[PDB]
Amino acid sequence: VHVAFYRNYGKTFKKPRRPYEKERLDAELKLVGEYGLRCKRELWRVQYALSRIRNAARMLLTLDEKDPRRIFEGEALLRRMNRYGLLDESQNKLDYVLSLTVENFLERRLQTLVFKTGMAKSIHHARVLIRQRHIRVGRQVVNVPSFMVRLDSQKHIDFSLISPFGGGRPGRVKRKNQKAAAK
Amino acid sequence: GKVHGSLARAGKVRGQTPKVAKQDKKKKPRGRAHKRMQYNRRFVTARGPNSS
Amino acid sequence: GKTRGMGAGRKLKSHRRRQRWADKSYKKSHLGNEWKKPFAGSSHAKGIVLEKIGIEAKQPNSAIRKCARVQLIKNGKKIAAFVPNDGCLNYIEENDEVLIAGFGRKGHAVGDIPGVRFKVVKVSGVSLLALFKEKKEKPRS
Amino acid sequence: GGKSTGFGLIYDSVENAKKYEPKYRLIRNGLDTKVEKSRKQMKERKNRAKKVRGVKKTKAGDA
RNA sequence: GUAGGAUAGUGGCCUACCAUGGUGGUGACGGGUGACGGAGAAUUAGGGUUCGAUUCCGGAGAGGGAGCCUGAGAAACGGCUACCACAUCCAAGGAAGGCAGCAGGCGCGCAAAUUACCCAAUCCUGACACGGGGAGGUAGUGACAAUAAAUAACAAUACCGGCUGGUAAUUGGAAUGAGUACAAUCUAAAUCCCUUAACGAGGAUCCAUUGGAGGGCAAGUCUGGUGCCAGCAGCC
Ligand SMILES: [K+]
Ligand SMILES: [K+]
Ligand SMILES: [K+]
Ligand SMILES: [K+]
Ligand SMILES: [K+]
Ligand SMILES: [K+]
Ligand SMILES: [K+]
Ligand SMILES: [K+]
Ligand SMILES: [K+]
Ligand SMILES: [Mg+2]
Ligand SMILES: [Mg+2]
Ligand SMILES: [Mg+2]
Ligand SMILES: [Mg+2]
Ligand SMILES: [Mg+2]
Ligand SMILES: [Mg+2]
Ligand SMILES: [Mg+2]
Ligand SMILES: [Mg+2]
Ligand SMILES: [Mg+2]
Ligand SMILES: [Mg+2]
Ligand SMILES: [Mg+2]
Ligand SMILES: [Mg+2]
Ligand SMILES: [Mg+2]
Ligand SMILES: [Mg+2]
Ligand SMILES: [Mg+2]
Give C127's strand partners.
C122
Up-side HSE of residue C119: CA atoms within 13 Å toward CB?
A: 19
What's the CA gap between A129 and A171, in Å, rounded? 13
> From the Cβ of A108, is strand E under 7 Å away?
no
CB-based burial, C61-92: b 16+ in 10 Å, e otherwise: eeebbbbbbbebeeeebebbbbbbbebbbbbb
Contacts 24+ apart (CB under 8 A), C61-68: C61/C112, C62/B4, C62/B5, C63/B5, C63/C112, C64/B4, C64/B5, C64/B6, C64/B7, C64/B9, C65/C112, C65/C113, C65/C116, C66/B7, C66/B10, C67/C113, C67/C116, C68/C92, C68/C98, C68/C120
The answer to whether the Cα torsion of C11, C16, C21, C26 is positive or negative is: negative
The pairs formed by B8-12 with CB atoms below 8 angstroms and a separation of 24 or more are B9/C64, B10/C66, B10/C86, B10/C87, B10/C88, B10/C89, B10/C90, B11/C86, B11/C87, B11/C89, B11/C90, B12/C87
The answer to whether D26 and D16 have CB atoms below 8 angstroms apart is: no
In angstroms, what CA-CA distances link C65 with A134, C57, C58, C112, C116?
A: 62, 7, 10, 9, 10
Report the SS3 class of residue D52.
coil
* Burial label, A74 (beta-carbon count in 10 A; 0-12, 13-18, 19+): buried
CA distance A130 to C76: 62
Chain C positions touching B7 (Cβ under 8 A) are 52-54, 64, 66, 89
| CA D20 to ligand 18 center in whole angstroms | 47
Upper half-sphere CA count for residue A151 (Cβ side, 13 Å): 11
B16/chain C closest Cα distance in angstroms: 11
H or E segment to which residue C70 belongs:
strand C64-72
- The CA–C1' separation of A166 and E85, in angstroms, is 81
Nearest residue to C85 via CA among C121, C60, C58: C121
User: Could you check: is the Cβ of residue A131 within 7 Å of any atom of nucleic acid strand E?
Assistant: yes
Q: Distance between CA atoms of A154 and A138, rounded to whole angstroms?
A: 9
Burial C10-25 (b: 16+ CB within 10 A, else e): eeeeeeeeeeeeeeee
Query: Which one of B2, B3, B6, B9 makes the best mutation probe of the C interface by having the most chain C beta carbons within 10 Å?
Result: B9
Min Cα separation A139/chain D (Å) = 10
Angle at A139 between CA A135 and CA A144, to 5 degrees: 40
Note the helical H segments in D1-63: 14-20, 23-29, 39-50, 57-60
Which 3 state secondary structure label does DSSP give A33?
Answer: helix
CB C85 within 8 A of CB C128: yes
Question: Which structural domain, as residue segments, surrounds residue C29?
Answer: 1-141
∠A115-A116-A119 over CA atoms, to 5°?
Answer: 50
Q: Is the CB of A58 under 7 A from strand E?
A: no
H or E segment to which residue D35 belongs: none
What single-letter amino acid sits at C89? Answer: L
| Type and span of the H or E element at C79 | strand C78-82
Q: How far apart are CA A23 and CA A45, in angstroms?
A: 19
Q: For C23, what's the count of Cα atoms within 13 Å in the CB-facing half-sphere?
A: 9
Spatial separation of the C-alpha atoms in residues B30 and B37, rounded to whole Å: 10
The dihedral of CA D46, D48, D51, D56: what is its sign? negative
Strands C78-82 and C64-72: antiparallel
Give the contacts of D26 (CB within 8 A, at least 6 positions apart): D17, D18, D32
- CA torsion sign for A38, A40, A46, A48 is negative
Which residues are paired to C82 by β-bridges?
C67, C119
Q: What is the rounded (10 degree) CA torsion for D14, D16, D21, D25?
A: 0
CA distance A131 to A146: 11
Domain tally for chain C?
1
C96 Cβ contact list (under 8 Å, min separation 6): C48, C49, C123, C124
Distance CA A114, CA A129 (A): 9
Q: Are A124 and B35 in contact (CB under 8 A)?
A: no
CB atoms within 10 A of CB C120: 27
Amino acid at D11: Y
Residue B11: CB less than 7 A from any atom in strand E: yes
A17 touches strand E (CB under 7 A): no
* Cα distance between residue C51 and residue C66, in whole Å: 11
Nearest CA in chain A to D2: A162
Chain D positions touching A140 (Cβ under 8 A) are none
One-letter amino acid for residue B45 of the chain: T
Residue B48: strand, helix, or coil: coil
DSSP A114-145: HHHHTSSSSHHHHHHHHHTT-EESSSSB---T
Sign of CA dihedral C40, C42, C44, C45: negative
Q: How far apart are CA A49 and CA A54, in angstroms?
A: 9
Instruction: Report the alpha-carbon distance of residue D49 to residue B29 in Å, rounded.
Output: 69
Dihedral of CA A121/A127/A128/A132: which sign? positive
Experimental technique used to determine this entry: cryo-EM
Q: Counting beta carbons within 10 angstroms of the beta carbon of residue C131, is it exposed (0 to 12), middle (13 to 18) or buried (19 or more)?
A: buried
Output DSSP code: residue C89. G
Upper half-sphere CA count for residue A169 (Cβ side, 13 Å): 7
- Compute the distance between CA of residue A23 and CA of residue A21 in angstroms, rounded to an integer: 6
CA A165-A183-A164 angle, 5° bins? 5
Cα gap A132→D12, rounded to integer Å: 47
Per DSSP, helices labelled H in chain C are 9-19, 24-30, 128-133
Instruction: Please provide residue A154's backbone torsions phi and psi, each rounded to the nearest 5 degrees.
Output: -60, -40
Distance CA A122, CA B33 (A): 13
- Give the ligand whose atoms come closest to the C-alpha of residue A2: 13
8 Å CB contact of B10 and C62: no
Neighbours of A92 (CB within 10 A): 10
Alpha helices (runs of H) in chain B, residue ranges in sequence order: 12-16, 32-39
Q: Would you list the DSSP string of A66-95?
A: T-HHHHHHHHHHHHHHHHTTSS-SS--STH
- Resolution of the determined structure in angstroms stands at 2.2
N- to C-terminal Cα separation, chain C:
70
CB contact under 8 A, A36 and B36: yes
User: No. of H helices and E strands in chain C?
Assistant: 3, 6
Q: What whole-number distance in Å separates Cα of residue C83 and Cα of residue C64? A: 11
Contact between chains at A32 and B39 (C-beta distance less than 8 A): yes
CA atoms within 13 A on the CB side of A49: 16
